[PDB]
């Protein structure tokens, strides 16, 4: 599962960078809030879940 | 040395420490966008 673990962390970095770009634009301009708010909060939730999963997937 | 699981991500960490400086520089870029109003 080591390769699985590496792929998981790579996906974590990908998601984290995506959130990095998206969050200022979503938060600053609430013009597209209907889908933007869902996008940003779902990205945060996926970030938390992925971190928690990797926590165990380390061991 | 990184944990042998994380060693693949060695290059990324190599650019982490200098990231804060960019933030400061970023400010002027922000003040560049609004044209220093």
């Amino acid at each position: 599962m080591s390769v699985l673990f590496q792929l998981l962390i790579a996906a974590f970095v990908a998601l984290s960078f995506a959130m990095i770009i998206g969050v200022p634009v979503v938060f600053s301009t609430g013009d597209a809030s209907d889908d933007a708010n869902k996008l940003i909060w779902g990205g945060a939730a996926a970030w938390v879940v992925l971190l928690f999963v990797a926590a165990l997937a380390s061991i | 040395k990184l944990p042998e699981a994380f060693s693949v991500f060695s290059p990324i960490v190599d650019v982490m420490p200098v990231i804060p400086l960019f933030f400061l520089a970023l400010a002027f870029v922000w003040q560049a966008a609004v044209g220093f109003k």
Partner: peptide, 23 residues
């Protein structure tokens, strides 16, 4: 070697600026 990630971050910053700058 390491200029790739540094360039990636250099793209990341001003792009975040620009996406707001469009609106």
């Amino acid at each position: 070697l390491q200029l790739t990630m540094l360039g990636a971050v250099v793209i990341a910053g001003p792009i975040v600026v620009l996406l707001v700058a469009l609106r």
